[PDB]
Amino acid sequence: RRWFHPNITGVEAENLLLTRGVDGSFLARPSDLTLSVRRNGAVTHIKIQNTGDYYDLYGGEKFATLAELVQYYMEHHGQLKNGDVIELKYPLNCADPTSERWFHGHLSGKEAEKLLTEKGKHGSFLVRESQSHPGDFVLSVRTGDNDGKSKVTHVMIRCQELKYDVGGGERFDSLTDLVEHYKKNPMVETLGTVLQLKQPLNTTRINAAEIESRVRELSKLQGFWEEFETLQQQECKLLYSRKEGQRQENKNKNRYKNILPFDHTRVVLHDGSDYINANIIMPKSYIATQGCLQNTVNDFWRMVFQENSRVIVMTTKEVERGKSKCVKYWPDEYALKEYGVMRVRNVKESAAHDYTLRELKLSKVGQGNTERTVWQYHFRTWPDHGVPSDPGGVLDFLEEVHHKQESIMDAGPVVVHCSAGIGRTGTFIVIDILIDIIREKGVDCDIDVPKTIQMVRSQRSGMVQTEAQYRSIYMAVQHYIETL
Numbered sequence: 001r002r003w004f005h006p007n008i009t010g011v012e013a014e015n016l017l018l019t020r021g022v023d024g025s026f027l028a029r030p031s032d033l034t035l036s037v038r039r040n041g042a043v044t045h046i047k048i049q050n051t052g053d054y055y056d057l058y059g060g061e062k063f064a065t066l067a068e069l070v071q072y073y074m075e076h077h078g079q080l081k082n083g084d085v086i087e088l089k090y091p092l093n094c095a096d097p098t099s100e101r102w103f104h105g106h107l108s109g110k111e112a113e114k115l116l117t118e119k120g121k122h123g124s125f126l127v128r129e130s131q132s133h134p135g136d137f138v139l140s141v142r143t144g145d146n147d148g149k150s151k152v153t154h155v156m157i158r159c160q161e162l163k164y165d166v167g168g169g170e171r172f173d174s175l176t177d178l179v180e181h182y183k184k185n186p187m188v189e190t191l192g193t194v195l196q197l198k199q200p201l202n203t204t205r206i207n208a209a210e211i212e213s214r215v216r217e218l219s220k221l222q223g224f225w226e227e228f229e230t231l232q233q234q235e236c237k238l239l240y241s242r243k244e245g246q247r248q249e250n251k252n253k254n255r256y257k258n259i260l261p262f263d264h265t266r267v268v269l270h271d272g273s274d275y276i277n278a279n280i281i282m283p284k285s286y287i288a289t290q291g292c293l294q295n296t297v298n299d300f301w302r303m304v305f306q307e308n309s310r311v312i313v314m315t316t317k318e319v320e321r322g323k324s325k326c327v328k329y330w331p332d333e334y335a336l337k338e339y340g341v342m343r344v345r346n347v348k349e350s351a352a353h354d355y356t357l358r359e360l361k362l363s364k365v366g367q368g369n370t371e372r373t374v375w376q377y378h379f380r381t382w383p384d385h386g387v388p389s390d391p392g393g394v395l396d397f398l399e400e401v402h403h404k405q406e407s408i409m410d411a412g413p414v415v416v417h418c419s420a421g422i423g424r425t426g427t428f429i430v431i432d433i434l435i436d437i438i439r440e441k442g443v444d445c446d447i448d449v450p451k452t453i454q455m456v457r458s459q460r461s462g463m464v465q466t467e468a469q470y471r472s473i474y475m476a477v478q479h480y481i482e483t484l
């Protein structure tokens with residue numbers, strides 16, 4: 001995902017495309033985002049907006065991932081705009097290493113040695129700005145098995161006329177190019193030692209007790225944006241197939257036709273006809289899904305029945321800012337409705353300020369002893385744009401949802417849906433997965449927010465949409481620990 005330039009201006013981008021690009025050259029940049037594309041020797045800037053539900057390209061489609069957006073237009077050519085045909089042919093790759101997992105720029109040689117000694121294993125590496133001779137770089141790698149059976153090796157990286165070397169051999173136009181080369185082609189030391197670059201040093205994992213210290217570090221000039229963008233740059237390792245969602249008979253069952261479930265995690269419906277825009281999320285498991293369509297309500301209840309789910313988390317109104325986000329899939333209080341072969345009674349509604357609880361009874365028509373209570377938790381106060389200012393309401397919601405699920409024996413996945421089921425839905429699941437660790441393992445536990453997002457983003461596409469949501473996950477964990 002080199003075509004993303006994290007710290008570029010429109011002028012720098014035109015320059016880049018005009019001097020180092022050709023027609024069909026393109027990159028993406030933070031402005032909401034901008035897609036910059038060279039055409040007829042001039043640059044078009046296509047606007048992309050994400051306020052927490054999806055990436056909306058002006059004059060184009062809605063996407064779960066910036067990578068999946070580029071993938072779509074590079075293969076599905078002619079769909080990009082005066083509506084004029086704009087071609088993404090040639091990515092212009094970024095050489096700025098700020099969004100790399102192994103680039104701790106301003107790290108001291110001593111501090112980097114301690115980190116690699118306390119947190120590192122065999123193959124933990126990092127690149128830092130040169131201690132004594134500035135403009136140059138140091139690759140520090142840990143190798144081994146106070147036994148002295150392990151060691152931290154330093155490797156000077158020279159920057160000579162905007163190219164990078166380890167004192168010999170090839171000269172790379174970026175540190176990434178050098179790292180990627182010496183990953184596949186490891187340096188072998190005198191007396192045999194192979195300086196293997198296995199995994200970047202983990203600096204994102206903290207002990208839950210020290211959340212307040214980390215959130216304070218990430219708030220300084222911010223790290224929250226720096227950490228998040230390092231996470232966005234790995235979304236390119238999660239371009240898994242979504243074939244079943246693109247099939248003819250299934251386009252009508254997607255609310256956003258390009259926000260599609262991964263084939264390898266999707267809820268397959270049996271006894272029907274097997275498709276729903278829904279994915280199983282396994283760290284208590286979850287089904288992450290989109291708000292119902294008119295034509296998908298019957299299939300939605302088939303899923304809840306099949307999966308033996310007794311709890312539904314809805315974090316959207318039916319309508320937001322004049323747009324439909326989810327159909328009413330539940331009866332009125334005290335009423336009884338049939339959704340295909342599925343029968344749902346609405347036993348009782350209990351209103352709080354932030355949410356409504358609906359006690360629904362679900363069953364198959366013709367089969368009385370198939371009946372189960374399915375508790376629906378409809379969060380009604382989530383702001384139309386962005387994230388709630390105070391996390392207390394969302395965590396109070398989570399605590400009540402967790403205690404209901406825990407109370408039912410042989411409960412299935414907690415079904416979680418918003419509009420497209422990736423922004424708010426992914427935010428809530430991820431907060432719930434993290435708070436759940438601190439519940440089972442106490443404040444003395446290892447939490448690693450981006451590890452958890454990447455694991456959930458490999459199960460459904462774009463599972464945490466915004467930096468605001470990303471930050472809101474930290475504030476949720478901070479708040480939960482504070483109130484303990």
Ligand SMILES: CC1(N)CCN(c2cnc(-c3cccc(Cl)c3Cl)c(N)n2)CC1
Pocket residue numbers: 097098099100101102103104105202203204226227228230231232234450451454
């Ligand atoms: C200062 C720096 N250049 C940016 C912050 N940083 C990191 C490191 N690692 C992750 C990470 C952790 C687990 C899984 C995944 Cl996929 C990722 Cl990307 C991350 N998001 N940021 C350190 C380097």
